[PDB]
Design an enzyme around this catalytic site. Structure first.
Site, mmCIF file in Angstrom:
data_model
loop_
_atom_site.group_PDB
_atom_site.id
_atom_site.type_symbol
_atom_site.label_atom_id
_atom_site.label_comp_id
_atom_site.label_asym_id
_atom_site.label_seq_id
_atom_site.Cartn_x
_atom_site.Cartn_y
_atom_site.Cartn_z
ATOM 1 N N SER A 74 6.593 0.072 6.022
ATOM 2 C CA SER A 74 5.989 -0.452 4.798
ATOM 3 C C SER A 74 4.681 -1.129 5.149
ATOM 4 O O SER A 74 4.670 -2.043 5.966
ATOM 5 C CB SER A 74 6.919 -1.478 4.142
ATOM 6 O OG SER A 74 8.220 -0.950 3.943
ATOM 7 N N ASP A 76 1.273 13.687 14.394
ATOM 8 C CA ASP A 76 1.457 13.676 12.950
ATOM 9 C C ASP A 76 0.130 13.749 12.215
ATOM 10 O O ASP A 76 -0.109 13.020 11.262
ATOM 11 C CB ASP A 76 2.256 12.443 12.511
ATOM 12 C CG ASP A 76 2.800 12.574 11.088
ATOM 13 O OD1 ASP A 76 2.985 13.718 10.614
ATOM 14 O OD2 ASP A 76 3.059 11.528 10.446
ATOM 15 N N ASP A 108 -6.970 7.586 1.255
ATOM 16 C CA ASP A 108 -6.493 8.575 2.213
ATOM 17 C C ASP A 108 -6.817 10.018 1.789
ATOM 18 O O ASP A 108 -7.018 10.299 0.606
ATOM 19 C CB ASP A 108 -4.991 8.370 2.494
ATOM 20 C CG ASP A 108 -4.089 8.897 1.399
ATOM 21 O OD1 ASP A 108 -2.986 8.331 1.242
ATOM 22 O OD2 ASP A 108 -4.442 9.879 0.715
ATOM 23 N N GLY A 140 8.890 6.908 6.197
ATOM 24 C CA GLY A 140 9.464 7.002 7.529
ATOM 25 C C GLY A 140 8.734 6.112 8.518
ATOM 26 O O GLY A 140 9.292 5.707 9.542
ATOM 27 N N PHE A 141 7.481 5.801 8.204
ATOM 28 C CA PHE A 141 6.656 4.950 9.054
ATOM 29 C C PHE A 141 6.961 3.462 8.861
ATOM 30 O O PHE A 141 6.748 2.653 9.767
ATOM 31 C CB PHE A 141 5.172 5.218 8.761
ATOM 32 C CG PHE A 141 4.797 5.042 7.311
ATOM 33 C CD1 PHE A 141 4.536 3.783 6.791
ATOM 34 C CD2 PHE A 141 4.732 6.139 6.461
ATOM 35 C CE1 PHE A 141 4.220 3.622 5.453
ATOM 36 C CE2 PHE A 141 4.417 5.983 5.123
ATOM 37 C CZ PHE A 141 4.162 4.720 4.620
ATOM 38 N N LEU A 152 0.834 -1.195 0.000
ATOM 39 C CA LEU A 152 0.000 0.000 0.000
ATOM 40 C C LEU A 152 0.875 1.254 0.000
ATOM 41 O O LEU A 152 0.508 2.270 -0.580
ATOM 42 C CB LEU A 152 -0.933 0.002 1.214
ATOM 43 C CG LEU A 152 -2.109 -0.974 1.119
ATOM 44 C CD1 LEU A 152 -2.859 -1.042 2.436
ATOM 45 C CD2 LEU A 152 -3.031 -0.526 0.010
HETATM 46 C C1 LIG Z 1 0.199 6.738 5.707
HETATM 47 N N1 LIG Z 1 0.088 5.962 4.459
HETATM 48 C C2 LIG Z 1 0.864 6.642 3.396
HETATM 49 C C3 LIG Z 1 0.118 6.590 2.048
HETATM 50 C C4 LIG Z 1 -0.074 5.170 1.461
HETATM 51 N N2 LIG Z 1 -0.544 4.173 2.468
HETATM 52 C C5 LIG Z 1 -1.850 3.685 2.485
HETATM 53 C C6 LIG Z 1 -2.751 3.807 1.386
HETATM 54 N N3 LIG Z 1 -3.999 3.290 1.514
HETATM 55 C C7 LIG Z 1 -4.463 2.658 2.618
HETATM 56 C C8 LIG Z 1 -3.605 2.509 3.743
HETATM 57 C C9 LIG Z 1 -4.004 1.841 5.034
HETATM 58 C C10 LIG Z 1 -5.101 0.913 5.153
HETATM 59 C C11 LIG Z 1 -5.437 0.322 6.416
HETATM 60 C C12 LIG Z 1 -4.665 0.666 7.579
HETATM 61 C C13 LIG Z 1 -3.571 1.584 7.480
HETATM 62 C C14 LIG Z 1 -2.791 1.924 8.698
HETATM 63 C C15 LIG Z 1 -1.567 2.539 8.691
HETATM 64 C C16 LIG Z 1 -0.847 2.865 9.948
HETATM 65 O O1 LIG Z 1 -1.526 2.830 11.120
HETATM 66 O O2 LIG Z 1 0.306 3.162 9.882
HETATM 67 C C17 LIG Z 1 -3.253 2.162 6.211
HETATM 68 N N4 LIG Z 1 -2.314 3.046 3.609
HETATM 69 C C18 LIG Z 1 0.413 3.654 3.478
HETATM 70 C C19 LIG Z 1 0.645 4.600 4.684
#
Ligand SMILES: CN1CCCN(c2cncc(-c3cccc(/C=C/C(=O)O)c3)n2)CC1
Ligand SMILES: [Mg+2]
Length: 277
Positions: free
Chosen positions: A20, A136, A97, A17-18, A13
């Site tokens: 993958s 954040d 998002d 920095g967080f 997805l």
């Molecule tokens: C911050 N994001 C940057 C943009 C692309 N990305 C996406 C895109 N679409 C859905 C999720 C998605 C779906 C379900 C739970 C989560 C939880 C993430 C977390 O708690 O770090 C993320 N994350 C990864 C992290």
């Protein structure tokens, strides 16, 4: 017991920095989930968690806010590996998002921005009530459950336990950090949180962030590049008050006139999300 016999990993997805995060499915009911990997070397803050031991602060924060409230993501489970930790998080479907939603649709109508903004306020407030400071708050860290019209705050990888004393460490997003941090490398949880909420609201109604360079953050002059109502501009400028104590409390934000008659999640989805969903 193993992570593989538990979930079926899907496509990536995103990463940063967080860490993958991958799309995933729980073999057992095919319940949609997300699988986040974070290396122990990346992890700077650790916590003990109730009756537990070594664990990333991210896990501690997640469990503290865990509950039936859909405003913050739910940690479903986690695993520790030789060099990393794996987090199994809930995953609404469809989902998108706030950053992509705004990138795609551009500046949001105020009625929509009101509903969305109100929902993050409730979510942040929830965290605070559970003793967790996110640190954040930004478009990328908020998910949109398109069918329900409910927003979800994600990525607690920069959070910390809420406290009433000063914070001298920050590792969230620079362009969302308050002028106290930029100048004096110190800030207070709720005040800082309100500043980023201001940046977020501006992002919602203008299609972009208000400040880019530290000099712009310190000066704090807000310029509206899109047509925005006077009430909204007032709220935004109130949250972006240079002096922390001049910023509104969460109560004041939600009692602010522009914040009145918010739309319900389903209503929001039906009027604004199902139109293209
Ligand atoms: C911050 N994001 C940057 C943009 C692309 N990305 C996406 C895109 N679409 C859905 C999720 C998605 C779906 C379900 C739970 C989560 C939880 C993430 C977390 O708690 O770090 C993320 N994350 C990864 C992290
Ligand atoms: Mg997280």
């Amino acid at each position: 017991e193993p992570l593989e016999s538990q979930y079926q990993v899907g496509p990536l997805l995103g990463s940063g920095g967080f860490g993958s995060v991958y799309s995933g499915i729980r073999v057992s009911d095919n319940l949609p989930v997300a699988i986040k990997h974070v290396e122990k070397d990346r992890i700077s803050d650790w916590g003990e968690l109730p009756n537990g031991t070594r664990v990333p602060m991210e896990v501690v924060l997640l469990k503290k806010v865990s509950s039936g409230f859909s405003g913050v993501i739910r940690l479903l489970d986690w695993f520790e590996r030789p060099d990393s930790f794996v987090l199994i998080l809930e995953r609404p479907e469809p989902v998108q998002d706030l950053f992509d939603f705004i990138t795609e649709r551009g500046a949001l109508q105020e009625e929509l921005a009101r509903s969305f903004f109100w929902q993050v306020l409730e979510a942040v407030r929830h965290c605070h009530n559970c003793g967790v400071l996110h640190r954040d708050i930004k478009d990328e860290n908020i998910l949109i459950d398109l069918n329900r019209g409910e927003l979800k705050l994600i990525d607690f990888g920069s959070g910390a336990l809420l406290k009433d004393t000063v914070y001298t460490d920050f590792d969230g997003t620079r362009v969302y950090s308050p002028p106290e941090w930029i100048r004096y490398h110190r800030y207070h949880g709720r005040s800082a949180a309100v500043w980023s909420l201001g940046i977020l609201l501006y992002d919602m109604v203008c299609g972009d962030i208000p400040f880019e360079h530290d000099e712009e953050i310190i000066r704090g002059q807000v310029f509206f590049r899109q047509r925005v109502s006077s009430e909204c501009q007032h709220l935004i400028r109130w949250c972006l008050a240079l002096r922390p104590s001049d910023r509104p409390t969460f109560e004041e934000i939600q009692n602010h006139p522009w914040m009145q008659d918010v739309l319900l999640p389903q209503e929001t989805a039906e009027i604004h999300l199902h139109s293209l969903s």
